Amino acid sequence: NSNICEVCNKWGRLFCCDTCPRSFHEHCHIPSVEANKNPWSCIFCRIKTIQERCPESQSGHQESEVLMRQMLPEEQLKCEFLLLKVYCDSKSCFFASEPYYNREGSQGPQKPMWLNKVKTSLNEQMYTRVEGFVQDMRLIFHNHKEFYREDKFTRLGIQVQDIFEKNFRNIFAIQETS
Ligand SMILES: [Zn+2]
Numbered sequence: 053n054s055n056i057c058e059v060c061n062k063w064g065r066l067f068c069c070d071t072c073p074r075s076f077h078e079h080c081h082i083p084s085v086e087a088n089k090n091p092w093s094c095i096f097c098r099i100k101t102i103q104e105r106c107p108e109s110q111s112g113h114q115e116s117e118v119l120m121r122q123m124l125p126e127e128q129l130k131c132e133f134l135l136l137k138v139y140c141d142s143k144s145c146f147f148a149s150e151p152y153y154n155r156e157g158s159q160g161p162q163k164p165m166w167l168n169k170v171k172t173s174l175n176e177q178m179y180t181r182v183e184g185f186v187q188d189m190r191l192i193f194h195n196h197k198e199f200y201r202e203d204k205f206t207r208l209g210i211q212v213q214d215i216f217e218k219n220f221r222n223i224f225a226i227q228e229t230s
């Protein structure tokens with residue numbers, strides 16, 4: 053197995069996947085690495101299994117249909133994986149913890165949002181449909197772009213949103229378009 057965490061790229065107390073060479077810190081994996089379970093398969097392996105059991109799940113889908121799906125176990129897992137893919141980018145640090153807003157010429161957002169809040173919300177089964185999760189994720193980046201205005205720091209929001217959106221289209225097999 054790898055000797056660094058797949059998500060944060062650091063060593064430490066790592067848990068190894070039994071079905072692939074990836075490794076994880078306990079709370080870097082989503083959901084948090086399960087207590088017992090031998091063997092244990094990581095979320096990458098669990099996602100690959102869903103795909104393998106239902107090859108047709110990779111055919112193109114409309115975003116509108118995906119968003120309305122209820123958060124049954126497979127859609128729960130897909131949103132956990134998508135959140136984990138955003139944490140995999142180092143730029144996610146800017147959006148992880150609770151933000152605060154005190155900049156001359158800007159006002160903070162009406163509804164602040166951050167990754168760890170979305171993580172807790174998933175863990176607590178607070179989303180009933182994929183749409184709830186996707187709306188909170190997109191709100192993170194929208195708040196950032198609106199608050200930072202013309203500061204070049206707005207680009208970090210565009211960058212991490214692009215990681216989100218690419219992974220959303222991949223994981224949920226959104227129909228390819230120009
Ligand atoms: Zn880690």
Ligand SMILES: [Zn+2]
Pocket residue numbers: 069070071072073074093094095096097
């Ligand atoms: Zn694995």
Ligand SMILES: [Zn+2]
Pocket residue numbers: 105106107
């Ligand atoms: Zn089938």
